[PDB]
Design an enzyme around this catalytic site. Structure first.
Site, PDB file in Angstrom:
ATOM      1  N   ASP A  70     -15.294  53.917   5.085  1.00  0.00           N
ATOM      2  CA  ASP A  70     -14.182  54.846   5.236  1.00  0.00           C
ATOM      3  C   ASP A  70     -13.963  55.120   6.710  1.00  0.00           C
ATOM      4  OD1 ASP A  70     -13.518  55.258   2.484  1.00  0.00           O
ATOM      5  OD2 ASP A  70     -15.322  56.492   2.297  1.00  0.00           O
ATOM      6  N   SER A  71     -12.851  55.765   7.043  1.00  0.00           N
ATOM      7  CA  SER A  71     -12.513  55.986   8.436  1.00  0.00           C
ATOM      8  C   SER A  71     -13.616  56.759   9.137  1.00  0.00           C
ATOM      9  CB  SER A  71     -11.198  56.744   8.572  1.00  0.00           C
ATOM     10  OG  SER A  71     -10.735  57.079   7.298  1.00  0.00           O
TER      11      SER A  71
END
Ligand SMILES: CCCCCCCCCCCCCCCCCC(=O)OC[C@H](COP(=O)([O-])OCC[N+](C)(C)C)OC(=O)CCCCCCCCCCCCCCCCC
Ligand code: SF4
Ligand code: SF4
Ligand code: SF4
Lengths: 206, 112, 114, 154, 76, 386, 176
Positions: free
Chosen positions: E37-38
């Site tokens: 994920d970011s």
């Protein structure tokens, strides 16, 4: 009459004339001017005019409102811009007071007035703390009255009176802990408003 | 000459009349860069010219003070300085222009 | 829909400020655990930080994100400057609050709340 | 043995109640009436209740005023630093049970949620005489203690 | 020592728990391939910052989405 | 480095607990960060659930050393929105007890100011005088402190017979008590060393920082709301406003001591000029009727019933009303929506702005000069925090 | 009208200078302060011998609450709930029903004495002088629960203190 507050006609004329004076000089921001029956002058301005209007009233020779007496906010949830920002100023030179009002909503910042009045520094921190109104370009904007980590803005009309959490000391973890609020006796809401109109002079139209 | 203005941090002025003449002249010069129809220019010019005329006629500092009705002459100098600062700011703000935006329909209605 | 901004003029600008806040919070956890002598692990503290950022992932309003970042930075300062006491830092974990039933049957047995 | 323990409790109970050094949290209004108890009319010092002390030399903590959530952790920490035996006197409606701010989001509804309380002094504020009555009530409570009699029978 | 850059960078990613090493190929994309994920990427960039003793502003940090890009950035 | 001043002195003190986060370099104060809110009790939100009468006792508990002055400010604000007028005897009683309250506050302000600096004897001498003035409060109201005596419309009850003579007896001897206080402090080189040139504030900075009261007058600003914007009967009494010349703690200390003497001067006129008549506005739709009327007259009973349940309705409107409280300008921004409960009630506490100036006033001073500077501002955190 | 508290110019003649030098070197103004505290040592103290002596109070004093009766012994309270309505602290809780004789009387009358602000508004609101604040102020307890009064406690307070409550009311009812 002994029981009736006497009217002061001279101050009503004086404050009216000064209200037009300010409206004529600051048309870019002034939206409304009114004087109450007890002779308080209120200038309602667009929020973009906070700094220009407050600077004019402080520095202009016929205004000289050198003292910021109070700065507060009023929550009116029915309005699109629920928050009303109220500046109460005092002129010692002319022995007069003026009230300057503007508005904002939950997401729109107001310009910090600290440059005009250093007194505003803590007032804006209190408005932020208690209403959640952000002031742009504030030297140190943070909570001032509530507990650290407190969530929400208690002076909003839709914040419950007793809040959401309460504190107690817990022996198991040996520290003060916060839990959802439970009341042994609930606060008893009263409906006090009479169903008969009291003041015809203020009747709203049907 | 006085010994004190009576106000902490406010120093006595040795040459009040000359200082006032400079400040009011500077104000009128700055007011020349404001549009002629701006109420700020017309009103500020009027009061500045009234004060400057009083400074011209009255040489005694005490007697001038009762004319200006502005406190100690150093307070009157300080106010002229603030007016000059204000006039410069109004040139950027340009408050004589039409109202930036109308408020929503019931923004200023009370009681709701 | 033309509105005055807080800081960010669009979501891409806002997402940048969000990531800086996460870095600052991520790096402070080991110090927070030590200064306050917390009894959680550094991994536990960082998991909570992720949990708090995670539950705001659906926001698409840059103004709302700026306020969320503004509030998050204030919380970081209170922790960094040691204005929070030990009690304040541990309120994110609700250690004394028994687990709340989540399914229908569990809630039906206990009371009337949904 | 039985006789000695009874007379020995009599001695230490006399000493502890005749020398009650207080730490006052002057939180709010009630601290004013607390000051009036130290003032010449009542002169709490004449009972052995000294004027100034220090938390770490104090025997009794007087919670004199409203306790907010923000102040709650600091008050508990002072209580935890007091050397024993230590007593707590809850003075006034706010400290007793929240009083006039009972329904506030930021007020602890009674300091007895944070510390154990020995005496509750009612009033808003209790008069200086009412507080003095509560302090002399705590002396009687100490006079009733039986630490050695209980210990000797373990 | 460029070739060492690969080792350090690829070594740091091994220590990161969310990346199963069977799928850790120098050209693997953190999002598409590794499924991170970011914020997981932000944790990696911070992990690289400690290893190589310099900072990486968000402007450049958002352009490093696979180990090779990290190698390119560090050497440069 | 970085310190944190204790919550309060080791001796008993009544003004609230402060968390003062300090930056120092050597002995010098580089920054003061007051962390307040330790006595914030949400008074202003609570007032929104009270009728206008039910909210009055909240004002005794703000500046809980100047109880009746806080009541008067709230009463004037409500009387202004109601458009009524309290009767003349009530106005004289309100000025009389306003000055008695000013004595109470200034004794607390000055002697605890000395007590914190270590000069502790005057505290004991002067709270015997405060004890006698508490007796005046209790004789008109039944309470020594939180009287709830001044109300919108006038005062709750009339003076008991014999009270005025006792007030005269107290006022007769009080100036000597002030003289003994000055003997201990005024010319004392140690007291002057602790106060002279400490916390100097310029006249212009004082105005822009929102100061009021002695914080203005210590710097030479000629402002007193009792003179410039008089309320009740303050325009019928003669007194002088003390003005300082150096703007420091010592000049503000002298102003408070002189204000005490002027309060005695004003009290002397109130005792001699007290007029006869009723004590609350003869208007049973605002002020409750006499108990004998309530038990005999149908109209009186109805109005008693409604005033003590719904309360009186206030016409819609907003006022900012302020008085010269012993601690400075104390005001209320009171908003009415036409009902019998206030819509909004902001309280302007004079100490709020004053404590916001502590950082400014303490620049380049010693750690112990901060003690004197919070002393000279006379801060009660009941009013600062609400 | 105003006055200056500190606007004096010291005299610089050698005599006045020497006067100030003597004050500095010989501490004369410090000796003067010692005289004032000495004069107090020989004054009679203001202390009273509590509990054998008591502070003076007036008939208006607002102390512990009590519920009152008519001379017949019937309760004065008629469950009108005006005191419950006016109480600034919401410290009063009342329930009522027709009594077995049809009389309008309370079944619950509680006062949380730890919520109460001892303001006296209830006794002003009462139309029958049923609830009063009595003269007792020496009723501190050892537990919180003892300060939650119910109707039995308040009626007992009325029976206990009526002799003095009635006299206090007799002395002040013409001011009300
Ligand atoms: C070693 C020398 C210690 C001598 C013991 C001192 C005890 C003094 C004392 O008890 O005073 C009489 C005390 C005085 O009584 P009191 O302290 O309870 O109360 C006196 C009356 N009032 C409070 C109203 C002023 O008598 C006692 O109470 C009995 C205590 C016995 C303790 C002695 C044990 C031996
Ligand atoms: S109990 Fe009453 S006097 Fe004491 S702090 Fe609370 S409101 Fe003030
Ligand atoms: S004295 Fe005041 S607070 Fe106490 S029960 Fe009566 S009305 Fe309520
Ligand atoms: S005590 Fe008085 S006011 Fe209260 S319910 Fe009974 S009769 Fe009514």
């Amino acid at each position: 009459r002994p029981t009736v507050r006497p009217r002061n006609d001279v101050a009503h004329k004086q404050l009216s004339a000064f209200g037009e004076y300010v409206a004529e000089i600051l048309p870019k921001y002034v939206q409304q001017v009114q004087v109450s029956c007890f002779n308080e002058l209120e200038i309602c301005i667009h929020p973009d005019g906070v700094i220009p209007v407050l600077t004019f009233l402080r520095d202009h020779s016929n205004a000289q409102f050198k003292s910021l007496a109070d700065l507060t906010a009023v929550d009116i949830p029915t309005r699109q811009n629920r928050f009303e920002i109220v500046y109460n100023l005092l002129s010692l030179r002319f022995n007069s007071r003026i009230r300057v009002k503007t508005y904002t909503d939950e997401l729109t910042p107001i310009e910090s007035s600290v440059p005009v009045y250093k007194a505003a520094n803590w007032y804006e921190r209190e408005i932020w703390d208690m209403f959640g109104v952000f002031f742009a370009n504030h030297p140190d904007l943070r909570r001032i009255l509530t507990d650290y980590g407190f969530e929400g803005h208690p002076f909003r009309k839709d914040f419950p009176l007793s809040g959401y959490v309460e504190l107690r000391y817990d022996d198991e973890v040996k520290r003060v802990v916060a839990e959802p609020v439970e009341l042994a006796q609930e606060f008893r809401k009263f409906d006090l408003n009479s169903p008969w109109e009291a003041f015809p002079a203020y009747r709203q139209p049907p | 000459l006085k010994k004190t203005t009576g106000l902490v941090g406010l120093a006595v002025c040795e040459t009040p009349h000359e200082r006032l003449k400079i400040l009011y002249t500077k104000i009128l010069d700055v007011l020349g860069h404001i549009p002629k129809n701006a109420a700020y220019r017309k009103y500020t010019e009027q009061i500045t010219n009234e004060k400057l005329s009083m400074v011209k006629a009255e040489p005694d500092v005490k007697k001038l003070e009762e004319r200006l009705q502005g406190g100690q002459i150093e307070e009157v100098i300080l106010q002229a300085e603030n007016e000059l600062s204000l006039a410069r700011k109004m040139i950027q703000w340009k408050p004589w222009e039409p109202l930036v935006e109308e408020p929503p329909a019931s923004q200023w209605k009370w009681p709701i | 829909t033309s509105v005055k901004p807080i800081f960010s003029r669009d979501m891409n600008e806002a997402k940048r400020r969000v990531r800086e806040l996460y870095r600052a919070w991520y790096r402070e956890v080991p110090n927070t655990v030590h200064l306050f002598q917390l009894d959680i692990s550094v991994k536990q503290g960082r998991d909570k930080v992720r949990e708090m950022f995670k539950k705001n992932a659906h926001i698409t309003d840059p103004r709302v994100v700026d306020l969320l970042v503004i509030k998050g930075k204030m919380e970081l300062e209170e922790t960094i400057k040691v204005w929070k006491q030990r009690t304040h830092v541990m309120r994110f974990f609700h250690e004394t609050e028994a687990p709340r039933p989540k399914d229908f049957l569990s809630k039906f047995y206990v009371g009337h709340d949904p | 043995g039985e006789y000695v323990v009874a007379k020995l409790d009599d001695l230490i109970n006399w000493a502890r109640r005749s020398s009650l050094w207080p730490m006052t949290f002057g939180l709010a209004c009630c601290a004013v009436e607390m000051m009036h108890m130290a003032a010449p009319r009542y002169d709490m010092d004449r009972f052995g209740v000294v004027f100034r002390a220090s938390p770490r030399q104090s025997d009794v903590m007087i919670v004199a005023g409203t306790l907010t959530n923000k102040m709650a952790p600091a008050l508990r920490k002072v209580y935890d630093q007091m050397p024993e035996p230590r007593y707590v006197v809850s003075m006034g409606s706010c400290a007793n049970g929240g009083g006039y701010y009972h329904y506030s989001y930021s007020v602890v509804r009674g300091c007895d949620r944070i510390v154990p309380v020995d005496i509750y002094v009612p009033g808003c504020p209790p008069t200086a005489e009412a507080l003095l009555y509560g302090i002399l009530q705590l002396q009687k409570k100490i006079k009733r203690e039986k630490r050695l009699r209980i210990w000797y029978r373990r | 020592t460029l070739e060492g850059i690969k080792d350090r960078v690829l070594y740091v990613l091994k220590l990161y728990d969310k990346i199963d090493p069977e799928k850790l190929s120098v050209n693997s994309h953190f999002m598409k391939d590794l499924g991170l994920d970011s914020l997981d990427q932000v944790e990696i960039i911070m992990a690289m910052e400690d290893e190589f003793g310099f900072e990486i502003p968000d402007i450049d940090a958002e352009k490093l989405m696979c180990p090779q890009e990290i190698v390119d950035y560090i050497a440069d | 480095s970085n310190l944190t001043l204790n919550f309060g002195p080791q001796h008993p003190a009544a003004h609230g607990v402060l968390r003062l986060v300090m930056e120092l370099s050597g002995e010098m104060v580089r920054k003061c960060d007051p962390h307040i809110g330790l006595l914030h009790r949400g008074t202003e939100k609570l007032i929104e659930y009270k009728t206008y009468l039910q909210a009055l006792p909240y004002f005794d508990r703000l500046d809980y050393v100047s109880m009746m002055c806080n009541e008067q400010a709230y009463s004037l604000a409500v009387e202004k929105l109601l458009n009524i007028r309290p009767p003349p005897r009530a106005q004289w009683i309100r000025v009389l007890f306003g000055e008695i309250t000013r004595l109470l506050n200034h004794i607390m302000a000055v002697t605890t100011h000395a007590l914190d600096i270590g000069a502790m004897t005057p505290f004991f001498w002067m709270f015997e005088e405060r004890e006698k003035m508490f007796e005046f409060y209790e004789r008109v109201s039944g309470a020594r402190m939180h009287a709830a005596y001044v109300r919108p419309g006038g005062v709750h009850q009339d003076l008991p017979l014999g009270l005025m003579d006792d007030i005269y007896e107290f006022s007769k001897n009080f100036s000597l008590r002030i003289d003994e206080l000055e003997e201990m402090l005024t010319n004392n080189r140690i007291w002057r060393n602790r106060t002279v040139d400490i916390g100097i504030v310029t006249a212009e900075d004082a105005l822009n920082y929102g100061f009021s009261g002695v914080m203005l007058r210590g710097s030479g600003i000629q402002w007193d709301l009792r003179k410039t914007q008089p309320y009740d009967v303050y325009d019928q009494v003669e007194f002088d406003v003390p003005i300082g010349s150096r703007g420091d703690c010592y000049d503000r200390y002298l102003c408070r001591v002189e204000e005490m003497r002027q309060s005695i001067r004003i009290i002397s006129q109130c005792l001699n000029k007290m007029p006869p008549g009723e004590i609350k506005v003869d208007d049973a739709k605002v002020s409750p009727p006499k108990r004998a009327e309530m038990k005999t007259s149908m109209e009186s009973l109805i109005h008693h019933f409604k005033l003590y349940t719904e309360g009186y309705q206030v016409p819609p409107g907003a006022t900012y009303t302020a008085i010269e409280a012993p601690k400075g300008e104390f005001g209320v921004y009171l908003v009415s929506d036409g009902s019998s409960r206030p819509y909004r009630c902001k309280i302007k506490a004079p100490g709020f702005a004053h404590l916001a100036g502590l950082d400014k006033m303490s620049k380049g001073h010693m750690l112990a000069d901060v003690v004197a500077i919070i002393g000279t501002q006379d801060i009660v955190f009941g009013e600062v925090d609400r | 009208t105003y006055k200056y508290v500190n606007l004096r110019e010291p005299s610089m003649d050698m005599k006045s200078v020497t006067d100030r030098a003597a004050q500095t070197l010989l501490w004369t103004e410090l000796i003067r302060g010692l005289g004032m505290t000495l004069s107090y040592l020989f004054r009679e103290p203001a202390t009273i011998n509590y509990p054998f002596e008591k502070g003076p109070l007036s008939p208006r004093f607002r102390g512990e609450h009590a519920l009152r009766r008519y001379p017949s012994g019937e309760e004065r309270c008629i469950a009108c709930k005006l005191c419950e309505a006016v109480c600034p602290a919401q410290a009063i809780t009342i329930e009522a029903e027709p009594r077995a004789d049809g009389s309008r009387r309370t079944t619950r009358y509680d006062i949380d004495m730890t919520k109460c602000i001892y303001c006296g508004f209830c006794q002003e609101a009462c139309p029958v002088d049923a609830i009063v604040e009595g003269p007792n102020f020496e009723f501190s307890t050892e537990t919180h629960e003892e300060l939650l009064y119910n109707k039995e406690k308040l009626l007992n307070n009325g029976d206990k203190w009526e002799a003095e409550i009635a006299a206090n009311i007799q002395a002040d009812y013409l001011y009300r």
